[PDB]
Every structure is written in C-alpha cells, then in structure tokens.
Amino acid sequence: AREAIAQMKAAALAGINSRLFGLDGNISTNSENTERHTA
Amino acid sequence: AREAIAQMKAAALAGINSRLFGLDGNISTNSENTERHTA
C-alpha cells in the first residue's frame, strides 16, 4: 500500500502552479495631480 | 477568496483622477475700480 498511496498523491496534483504571491493592493495608474483651478 | 476580492477592488476603480483640490472661491476677473464721476 505504501506504493499505491504515493501514486494517488502524485496523480491528484499536476498543473497547480504555486505562485506564492497573490496580488498587490497598491495601484498607481496615474500619479496624484496636486494642482488648482481658478476662473 | 483573498485573490478575488482584490480583483474586484481594482476592477471597480480606474480613470478616477483624485485631484485633491476642488475649485477656489476667490475670483478676480477685473480689479476693483475705485474712481469717481462728476457732471
């Protein structure tokens, strides 16, 4: 049975790419403006 | 789910330009006259 177990564990895991990062929360698509308006 | 949440938050915010200023109240299109009239 020691063989058959390892065959199961290996058969049920393939293609799963770990990729320890998820996604970052910090977005900056465009920097902050910091300018004014007048008439 | 930790991935899917961040995808939502990033998908629902794009193009919004912060622009921390609104508009100024002080207008001066033409300076104050301070002159008189007579006959």
Closest CB to B3 among A23, A34, A35: A23
Q: Are A13 and B1 in contact (CB under 8 A)?
A: no
In this structure, the number of other CB atoms found within 10 A of the CB of residue B10 comes to 14
Contacts of A33 (CB under 8 A, 6+ apart): B17, B18, B19, B20
Structure determination method: cryo-EM
Chain A CB contacts of B31 under 8 Å are none
- The distance of B33 to chain A (nearest Cα, Å) reads 19
Q: Say what the resolution is, in angstroms.
A: 4.0
Cα B10 to chain center, whole Å?
A: 23
